[PDB]
C-alpha cells in the first residue's frame, strides 16, 4: 500500500514575471505577478499595493503580457504555461462578484520539435494583430487575433535560422514586422522579417543583417519616436535603425550581464536594465529634431542607480517607484529619488515582500524546548542568502481591553496595574508618563473595572465619591472598601454586577431599571467574578439560569441564587490562566471550561444537556477555570488554558495544540487597530516568518541540542585580485563574527588565477539559538568546497561531533578527485578539529547510520567506524553506483540515490559486515531528491518537476523478481523539489486516533513552497479520489484546463496519467464554494465509513472530513 496525500502549506513566492496595465478597469493601473502558479493582481492606490484577487492555475505560468485589441475597453491578458497551454483572460466585475473569464483557451503543444534552450518567448504586435510564440527550435507559432478563433487555431512558420537566441517585435511598421538575434557558426547576427498572415510566410525584412557581438543577450523594442532595435550584451550597447548603427561599449557594464529590462517613458526616452549582481542600470536615449517633423537620436547613455535585490523582474508603476522582482531574494518597492545622498545611490527601498527563495535544506528544531517542531531553512542565494525561519501561529505585560472609544481608542484611560488596587488616569492618546498627580489616587494600580446600567458609572476611590462624568452625576453605589478590599481575586461583568461586599450584602444591582435581589443568601464561596455570562444580551427573563460552580465540580448545575452544600472537594487548583475565549463562527456555543486539574473538559455544550465531551487526558498542574472575556466577532465560546502550554484552534468539541505568536502571555491580547498591516501586532499568512539576514549564500544547515547551536555551511564569493591575494566584495556575517579560525591540514596539501578571477570560499558558521548571532566562522582551505554537514553521536563517545565532508575543485578538472571528512567539536567559543581522514574522492551527503557513519564518495558508499583513538576506520564498501548524490537512512535500510540511475536500496548485514542489494529500480528518472516514507514505500522528487513513490513488493517469487521496485504512484507537482524532512507544524503526538495523517513529511522546493505529504487508508484513498473526481467534474477551472491533464506524469517521453496520489488544492477548494454548489456535488455520493452502512452523502459529514484533512495543513 502507498496512497499519498500531498498539500501545500505555504504558497510559492518567487516572482516569475510582471506586467502593468489597465486590467481591472480603464482608470487604474495594475501589477500582475504569477509566482509559480498563483497569480495575484494588485490595484495601485494611494494606501500602497492593495491586492484585489489571487487565482490558482493548473500550470507553471511562463509567458505573461497584456494586450488591448480594438473594440475592448480593458486590455486582455495572455497566459502561456509550461505545459504548452494558451489562455486569454479578461477581468470581469459586477458590483462585487469578481471572476476571470477565459475568452479563448487552447493547447499549442506540437508532437514533433525540440524545446528551445532559452525557454519560451511570447511577443505581441504593437497594433495588437497577432501573437508570436518561439516554442520549438526552428519553428515560429503565430496565432491570429480574429474573434472566431476561440479554439486558438494557430499556424507554424519555418525559418532558416535554428539557434535563435532572442526574438522581439519592431515599431512603426505598417505590416507586422519582427526582429531576431540568432547564433550560427559564423557568429551572432540580427535579422528582421516582415511576417504576413495572408501568405503565412516571412518576407525580406526592412533592413539587412548586421554582425552583432558574440554575446548578444536580448533585444529591446524602441517605440515610435525613434524606432529600430536595441541590442544589449556584455560590454556592448548598440542601437540599430536602418542606416544607423550607434554602438558604445560602456566601462561600467563590464562587471556582469543584463538579465531583465523595462521601459519607463511611453515615448521611449528612458529604460531600466537589471543585472546579475543586483545593480539597477538606467539607459538614456538622447533625441533631437531635424528640420520639421523628423526626430532622430543623438547618443546613448548608461548610468548606475544603486544596488537592489537579485533582479529577475523590473517594472515602473508610477511616481518614480519601481517594483524590483526577484527569484532568489525578497521583492522590493524601490524609490528613485531625483537627488542623491551619502554613498551616492538614487535607489531607496520602501516595502519588502518576503520571498522564501531557493530553499536548499531545512530542519525541524525546538526553540520552545517542549518536544514539538518548528521549521528552519537556509533560504536565499548569492549575496542575499538568509536564514528565514518558518513557524506556526496566529517585557510588555498587561493590556488595555477597554475599547471604550468606538473609533478614537488609542489610550484614554491609563489602566495601570499592581496587586489589589486601582490606577485609572485620564490620557490623551498613547502618551503615558510617570508624572503622578494628586487629583486622582496614583499609589493604587488596577486589575479590572466595569459598567453597570444606563451609564450610572462608579468612580472607585477610597477618598471620596467624585464622579468625573456627566451622565450619573451622583454619589450612589461607589465600590466601597469594607476591609480595604480592592480588586484582589475579584471581578465584575456588565449585563449584571454581582459583588461580595464583606459577607452580608444587599445585592448591588440597584440601578435605573436594574433592580434585583438574588445574591442575598450568604455565599460561603467568594468568587473573583461570581456571576453568569448570558447568551448574548438577554435580560429580564430566565432563558438559562443554570451555570454551575467549579469549587467542587459536580454534575449538579448550581444556579446563582441557590448556593447549596455538597461534598468537600476543594482540589489543589488555584493557578490562574489568561482567558477563556469567545470564538465561534455563526451560531454554535460551547463551554470548554479550563478544568486543568484533571479530565480536561472540552464540553461540546448541548445547552439543554451539556453532559460530557471528548476528553483529552493531559495530566497537568493545578489550574481550574477562570472566567474572562474579550469580544472580536459574533463569537460565544470559552477556552481551556491548563498549565503546560496549550494553544488551541476553534472546533466543535475536539482540540489541537499549537502556538500563539506572542512568546509570553500572562495578561495579553493584541490591538484591533488597522493602521499598519505590514508591521502587525505579532509580538515575539497562517505561517509566520522570522528573517535573519546572513548577507551570504548558505548551503547546508543542521542543529545540535547539547550545545543548542546551528551549524550552517555557507559560501562567500570574493573577487580574486593579485594585490593582496583575495579581496572581499561586501561585508558578510563571516567577517563580522565574534571569532575566527582557519583550517590547517598539513598532510593534505594538494592553480594560479588572474586579477579578474573570483574565488568561492566555503565556511562553517556556528549560530546561537537565542540571539541568532554568529559566534565562530571556521574558514576552509583554498579551492575547497564543502558539501555536507551532520551533528551526530558516534560509537561509544559521549561527545557529539560536527562532521563536514568537503572536496577540492579546480577549474581544469570536471570531477573532484580528492576530498576530506573533517570532524569538529564545539566545547566553548572555538571549534576544535579531531580527525582529518583524507579520502580520494568527493563527499556528497553524510548520514549517521547506527552509531557509525556512512559516506557518499563518488561511485562509492563507505562505512566508517569511530574508534577509541579518535579516527575513522573503513568498515565496508559498495561500488555498484555511478555516484551517490542524495542518501537517506531508516533502521537497517539505506536509500541511495543517483543523478541518472534510480533508487538503490541497500541492506546492512550485521553478521557479515558488508552491504547487500535487496532491490534496485530499473527506470531512467534523472533523480533530484530521495526520501523513505515507510518500511516499504520509497518516495522521490525529480529534476523535471515530478514526484513518484515506489514499493518493494513482497508478493514476488524467491528470485530476481523481488529485485525490482515498480513506480506505484506518480504525480506532477510542477515545482523543483529540493529538500525533504520529517515533522509537522501541529503538535506531533497522538495523531493515530483515527486521524487521516499516517506520517507527515515536509518538502521544500526551489521556488519556495512548503508542502506536506502523508499516508491514508485504502477506503479513505478510494473515497477521496472519487470525491476529488466528482469535484473536478463539478467545479470550473480558471483557464478551461483539465486538472487530470495538469497533474498527469509528464517526462520528455512518458505521459502516463497520475495514479495513487490525492491532490491538495482541489481537495481544499471544496470549502470555497456556495451551498448550491455543495448540493450539486455529493448529490449521489456513497460516503463509506465501514463496509456498506450509512450511505447518505450528507454535506456536513463531508465538511467534517475535509476539516479533518485540513487539520494537518
Amino acid at each position: 500500500m502507498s496512497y499519498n496525500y500531498v498539500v501545500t502549506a505555504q504558497k510559492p513566492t518567487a516572482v516569475n514575471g510582471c506586467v502593468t496595465g489597465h486590467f481591472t478597469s480603464a482608470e487604474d493601473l495594475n501589477l500582475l505577478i504569477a509566482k509559480n502558479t498563483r497569480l495575484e493582481i494588485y490595484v495601485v492606490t494611494a494606501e500602497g499595493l492593495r491586492p484585489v484577487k489571487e487565482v490558482g492555475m493548473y500550470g507553471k505560468i511562463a509567458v505573461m503580457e497584456l494586450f488591448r485589441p480594438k473594440g475592448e475597453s480593458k486590455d486582455l491578458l495572455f497566459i502561456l504555461t509550461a505545459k504548452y497551454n494558451a489562455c486569454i483572460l479578461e477581468y470581469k466585475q459586477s458590483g462585487e462578484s469578481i471572476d476571470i473569464i477565459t475568452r479563448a483557451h487552447g493547447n499549442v503543444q506540437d508532437r514533433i520539435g525540440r524545446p528551445s534552450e532559452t525557454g519560451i518567448i511570447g511577443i505581441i504586435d504593437p497594433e495588437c494583430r497577432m501573437i508570436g510564440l518561439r516554442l520549438y527550435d526552428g519553428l515560429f507559432k503565430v496565432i491570429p487575433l480574429d474573434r472566431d478563433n476561440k479554439e486558438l487555431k494557430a499556424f507554424n512558420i519555418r525559418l532558416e535560422e535554428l539557434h535563435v537566441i532572442d526574438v522581439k517585435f519592431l515599431y512603426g511598421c505598417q505590416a507586422p514586422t519582427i526582429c531576431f538575434v540568432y547564433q550560427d557558426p559564423q557568429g551572432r547576427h540580427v535579422k528582421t522579417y516582415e511576417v504576413s498572415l495572408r501568405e503565412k510566410e516571412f518576407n525580406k525584412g526592412p533592413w539587412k543583417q548586421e554582425n552583432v557581438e558574440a554575446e548578444a543577450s536580448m533585444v529591446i523594442a524602441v517605440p515610435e519616436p525613434f524606432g529600430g532595435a536595441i541590442i544589449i550584451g556584455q560590454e556592448s550597447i548598440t542601437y540599430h535603425n536602418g542606416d544607423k548603427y550607434l554602438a558604445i561599449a560602456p566601462p561600467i557594464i563590464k562587471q556582469s550581464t543584463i538579465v531583465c529590462h523595462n521601459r519607463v517613458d511611453p515615448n521611449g526616452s528612458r529604460y531600466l536594465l537589471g543585472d546579475m549582481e543586483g545593480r539597477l542600470f538606467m539607459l538614456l536615449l538622447e533625441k533631437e529634431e531635424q528640420m520639421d517633423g523628423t526626430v532622430t537620436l543623438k547618443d546613448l547613455r548608461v548610468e548606475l542607480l544603486g544596488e537592489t535585490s537579485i533582479a529577475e523582474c523590473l517594472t515602473y508603476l508610477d511616481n518614480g517607484v519601481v517594483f524590483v522582482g526577484s527569484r532568489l531574494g525578497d521583492s522590493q518597492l524601490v524609490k528613485l529619488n531625483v537627488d542623491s545622498n551619502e554613498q551616492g545611490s538614487y535607489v531607496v527601498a520602501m516595502e519588502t515582500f518576503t520571498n522564501l527563495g531557493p530553499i536548499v535544506d531545512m530542519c525541524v528544531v525546538d526553540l520552545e524546548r517542549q518536544g514539538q517542531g518548528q521549521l528552519v531553512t537556509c533560504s536565499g542565494a548569492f549575496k542575499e542568502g538568509s536564514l528565514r525561519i518558518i513557524r506556526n501561529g496566529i517585557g510588555i505585560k498587561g493590556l488595555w481591553p477597554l475599547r471604550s472609544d468606538p473609533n478614537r481608542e488609542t489610550d484614554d484611560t491609563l489602566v495601570l496595574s499592581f496587586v489589589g488596587q486601582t490606577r485609572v488616569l485620564m490620557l490623551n492618546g498613547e502618551e503615558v508618563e510617570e508624572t503622578e498627580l494628586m487629583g486622582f489616587v496614583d499609589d493604587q494600580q488596577t486589575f479590572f473595572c466595569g459598567n453597570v446600567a444606563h451609564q450610572q458609572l462608579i468612580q472607585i476611590t477610597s477618598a471620596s465619591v467624585r464622579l468625573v462624568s456627566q451622565e450619573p452625576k451622583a454619589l450612589v453605589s461607589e465600590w466601597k472598601e469594607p476591609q480595604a478590599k480592592n480588586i484582589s481575586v475579584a471581578s465584575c461583568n456588565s449585563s449584571q454586577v454581582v459583588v461580595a461586599v464583606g459577607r452580608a450584602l444587599y445585592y448591588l444591582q440597584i440601578h435605573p431599571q436594574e433592580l434585583r435581589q438574588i445574591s442575598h443568601t450568604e455565599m460561603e464561596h467568594e468568587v473573583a467574578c461570581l456571576d453568569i455570562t448570558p447568551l448574548g444580551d438577554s435580560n429580564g427573563l430566565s432563558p438559562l439560569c443554570a451555570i454551575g460552580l467549579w469549587t467542587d465540580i459536580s454534575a449538579r448545575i448550581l444556579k446563582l441564587p441557590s448556593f447549596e452544600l455538597l461534598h468537600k472537594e476543594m482540589l489543589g487548583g488555584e493557578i490562574i490562566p489568561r482567558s477563556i475565549l469567545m470564538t465561534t463562527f455563526e451560531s454554535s456555543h460551547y463551554l470548554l471550561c479550563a478544568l486543568g486539574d484533571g479530565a480536561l473538559f472540552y464540553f461540546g455544550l448541548n445547552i439543554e444537556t451539556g453532559l460530557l465531551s471528548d476528553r483529552k487526558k493531559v495530566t497537568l498542574g493545578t489550574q481550574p477555570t477562570v472566567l474572562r472575556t474579550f469580544r472580536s466577532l459574533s463569537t460565544t465560546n470559552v477556552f481551556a488554558c491548563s498549565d503546560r502550554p496549550t494553544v488551541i484552534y476553534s472546533s466543535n468539541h475536539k482540540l489541537v495544540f499549537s502556538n500563539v505568536n506572542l512568546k509570553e502571555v500572562n495578561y495579553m491580547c493584541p490591538l484591533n487597530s488597522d493602521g499598519y498591516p505590514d508591521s502587525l501586532a505579532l509580538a515575539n499568512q497562517k505561517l509566520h516568518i522570522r528573517t535573519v539576514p546572513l548577507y551570504e549564500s548558505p548551503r547546508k544547515i543542521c542543529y545540535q541540542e547539547v550545545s543548542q547551536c546551528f551549524g550552517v555551511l555557507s559560501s562567500r564569493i570574493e573577487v580574486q585580485d593579485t594585490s593582496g591575494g583575495t579581496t572581499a566584495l561586501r561585508p558578510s556575517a563571516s567577517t563580522q563574527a565574534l571569532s575566527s579560525s582557519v583550517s590547517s591540514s598539513k598532510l593534505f596539501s594538494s592553480h594560479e588565477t588572474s586579477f579578474g578571477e573570483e574565488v568561492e570560499v566555503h565556511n562553517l558558521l556556528i549560530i546561537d539559538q537565542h540571539t541568532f548571532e554568529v559566534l565562530h566562522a571556521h574558514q576552509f582551505l583554498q579551492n575547497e568546497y564543502a558539501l555536507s554537514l551532520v551533528s551526530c553521536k558516534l560509537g561509544k563517545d559521549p561527545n557529539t561531533y560536527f562532521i563536514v565532508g568537503t572536496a577540492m575543485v579546480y577549474p581544469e578538472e570536471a570531477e573532484p578527485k580528492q576530498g576530506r571528512i573533517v570532524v569538529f567539536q564545539y566545547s566553548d567559543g572555538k571549534l576544535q578539529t579531531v580527525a582529518e581522514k583524507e579520502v580520494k574522492g568527493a563527499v556528497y551527503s553524510m548520514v549517521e547510520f547506527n552509531g557509525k557513519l556512512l559516506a557518499s564518495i563518488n561511485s562509492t558508499v563507505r562505512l566508517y567506524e569511530w574508534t577509541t583513538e579518535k579516527e575513522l576506520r573503513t568498515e565496508c564498501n559498495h561500488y555498484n553506483n555511478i555516484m551517490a548524490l542524495y542518501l537517506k537512512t531508516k533502521g537497517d535500510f539505506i536509500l541511495v540515490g543517483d543523478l541518472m540511475r534510480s533508487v538503490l536500496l541497500l541492506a546492512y548485514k550485521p553478521m557479515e559486515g558488508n552491504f547487500e542489494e535487496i532491490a534496485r529500480d530499473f527506470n531512467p528518472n534523472w533523480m533530484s531528491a530521495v526520501e523513505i516514507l515507510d518500511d516499504d514505500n520509497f518516495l522521490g522528487a525529480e529534476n523535471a518537476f515530478n514526484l513518484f513513490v515506489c514499493q518493494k513488493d513482497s508478493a514476488a517469487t524467491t528470485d530476481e523478481e523481488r529485485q525490482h521496485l515498480q513506480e506505484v504512484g506518480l504525480f506532477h507537482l510542477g515545482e523543483f523539489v529540493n529538500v525533504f524532512c520529517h515533522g509537522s507544524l501541529v503538535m506531533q503526538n497522538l495523531g493515530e486516533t483515527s486521524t487521516p495523517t499516517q506520517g507527515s513529511v515536509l518538502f521544500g522546493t526551489v521556488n519556495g513552497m512548503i508542502g506536506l505529504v502523508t499516508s491514508l487508508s485504502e477506503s479513505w484513498y478510494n473515497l477521496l479520489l472519487d470525491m476529488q473526481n466528482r469535484l473536478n467534474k463539478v467545479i470550473k477551472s480558471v483557464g478551461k484546463i483539465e486538472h487530470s491533464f495538469w497533474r498527469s506524469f509528464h517526462t520528455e517521453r512518458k505521459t502516463e496519467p497520475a495514479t495513487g496520489f490525492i491532490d491538495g488544492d482541489l481537495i481544499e477548494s471544496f470549502l470555497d464554494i456556495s451551498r448550491p454548489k455543495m448540493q450539486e456535488v455529493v448529490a449521489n455520493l456513497q460516503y463509506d465509513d465501514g463496509s456498506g452502512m450509512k450511505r447518505e452523502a450528507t454535506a456536513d459529514d463531508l465538511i467534517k472530513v475535509v476539516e479533518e484533512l485540513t487539520r494537518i495543513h
Binding site: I112, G138, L139, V809, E815, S859, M900, R901, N943, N978
Partner: protein, 394 residues
C-alpha cells in the same frame, strides 16, 4: 563542468543545455567496460560462429531490458541484459526465417516483432506466444529494413532491395493468411540517370503520416507524406522533402544508416564516405549544420544509434571498434571503444538506460558494455577479466 552544474542546480534551478537533459556527462566516456562475463558469443548450429546482424533493444513495459540479436543463420534470439545470474543468458531462441535476416523492429509497448530477410516476405511474430502471426509477401526482391511508428502501433513500413516501399497495416484483414500492402511506392530511390543500385537502404518513420527514406546510389534523402496516398500514382513519385548529398567524391555514394532523436527534429545519416551528417527536419535548411568524421564506413552493413537523452552518437567503424561523438561539439576528437577483433556492424544504445550499450560485430561476438567507475575496485583481476576498453583518440 558536470560537478559545477550539479553544485549550481539547487541554487538556480533547472537550466537548459540544448539537448533533452542536463548534467553534461562528457567526463565519464572513458569508463565504459565490458567484462568477459557479460560478453556473448554467437555459436552456429554446426559449431561455426555466425556473425550477428541486427541487434536492438525493446520498448515494452517492464521488459525493456530484453535484446533482439539476430544472427545470419535465421536463429533469432532474445536475451536479458540487466540481471547478473550467469546461467542461461539466452532467454529465447527460435527459427523465424529460412534465409539470412537483415533487420529487426519491434512494435512500441508490446511483445511483438517484425523480421526481414531475402525470403521476399516480412514475418510478424508475437514473441509472448512464439507463433507466426503474420506474413508480408509482396516484395519482388530481398528486404532491407523495417521500422515502426513511435506514435502508431498498427501500421509500419517495409523497404525492399527491389526499390520498393510499402506500408503494412495490422488492422487490415488478411485474405489467405498473407498481409496485403496498404500503400506502395515503386522506385522511391532510383538513380537520376532492377539492379543493385535500385534499392532503398533505410526507411524510418517520423510521425503518423511522414516517411524518411534513403537509398543506395542517389545519395539523397526523400521525405514523403503518407497522407498523400500513392495508390496508382502512375509516374515517378515526387518527394515532399529532398536532402541532397553535401559531398566531394563523385562515386556512387550512399547512406548506410539513419537515426532520429527522441523528438524527430534532428536526423543523423551515416554515409559511406567516412562521414556522418546531421540535418534539421523542423527547419528548411537543407545544408548540414554539423558533420562527424573518423569512422570508416566501407561496408553497407554498419549501423548507428543515439543516446536515450539525445546527447551522444554511437556508430560502427572499420577500425574494429565503435566510435562515440558528442552532438554539441563535433570538433572534438571522438571516443573509441576498443576490444573487437573484427568489423563492428551494429551498435544500440538502450532507449531507457544511459549505462548499457550493446555492440554486435562481425567478430561473431556480441558485447554488452556498462559503465565502470570507481577504479579502487576489489582485487581479483586487472586485465585478465576484461575484453574491451575505452580510449580517447590521440
Amino acid at each position: 563542468m558536470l560537478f559545477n552544474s550539479v553544485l549550481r542546480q539547487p541554487q538556480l534551478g533547472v537550466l537548459r543545455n540544448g539537448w533533452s537533459s542536463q548534467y553534461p556527462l562528457q567526463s565519464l566516456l572513458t569508463g565504459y567496460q565490458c567484462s568477459g562475463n557479460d560478453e556473448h558469443t554467437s555459436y552456429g548450429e554446426t559449431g561455426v560462429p555466425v556473425p550477428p546482424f541486427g541487434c536492438t533493444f525493446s520498448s515494452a513495459p517492464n521488459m525493456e531490458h530484453v535484446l533482439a540479436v539476430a544472427n545470419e543463420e535465421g536463429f533469432v534470439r532474445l536475451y536479458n541484459t540487466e540481471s547478473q545470474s550467469f546461467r542461461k543468458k539466452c532467454f529465447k531462441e527460435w527459427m523465424a526465417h529460412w534465409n539470412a535476416v537483415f533487420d529487426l523492429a519491434w512494435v512500441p509497448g508490446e511483445l511483438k516483432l517484425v523480421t526481414a530477410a531475402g525470403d521476399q516476405t516480412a514475418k510478424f511474430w508475437d514473441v509472448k506466444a512464439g507463433e507466426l502471426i503474420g506474413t508480408c509477401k509482396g516484395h519482388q526482391c530481398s528486404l532491407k529494413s523495417v521500422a515502426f511508428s513511435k506514435f502508431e502501433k498498427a501500421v509500419f513500413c517495409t523497404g525492399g532491395r527491389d526499390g520498393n516501399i510499402m506500408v503494412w497495416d495490422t488492422r487490415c484483414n488478411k485474405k489467405d493468411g498473407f498481409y496485403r500492402q496498404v500503400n506502395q511506392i515503386s522506385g522511391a530511390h532510383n538513380t537520376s540517370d532492377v539492379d543493385f543500385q535500385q534499392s532503398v537502404t533505410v526507411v524510418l518513420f517520423q510521425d503518423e503520416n511522414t516517411l524518411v527514406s534513403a537509398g543506395a546510389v542517389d545519395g539523397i534523402i526523400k521525405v514523403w507524406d503518407l497522407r498523400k496516398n500513392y495508390t496508382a500514382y502512375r509516374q515517378e513519385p515526387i518527394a515532399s522533402k529532398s536532402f541532397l548529398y553535401p559531398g566531394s567524391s563523385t562515386r556512387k555514394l550512399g547512406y548506410s544508416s539513419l537515426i532520429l532523436d527522441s523528438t524527430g527534429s534532428t536526423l543523423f545519416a551515416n554515409c559511406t564516405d567516412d562521414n556522418i551528417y546531421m540535418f534539421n527536419m523542423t527547419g528548411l535548411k537543407t545544408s548540414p549544420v554539423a558533420i562527424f568524421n573518423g569512422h570508416q564506413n566501407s561496408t553497407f552493413y554498419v549501423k548507428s544509434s543515439l543516446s536515450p537523452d539525445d546527447q551522444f552518437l554511437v556508430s560502427g567503424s572499420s577500425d574494429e571498434a565503435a566510435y562515440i561523438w558528442k552532438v554539441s561539439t563535433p570538433w572534438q576528437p571522438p571516443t573509441v571503444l576498443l576490444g573487437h577483433s573484427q568489423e563492428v556492424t551494429s551498435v544500440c544504445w538502450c532507449p531507457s538506460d544511459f549505462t548499457k550499450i550493446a555492440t554486435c560485430s562481425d567478430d561473431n561476438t556480441l558485447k554488452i558494455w556498462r559503465l565502470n567507475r570507481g577504479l579502487e575496485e576489489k582485487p581479483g583481476g586487472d586485465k585478465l577479466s576484461t575484453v574491451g576498453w575505452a580510449s580517447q583518440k590521440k
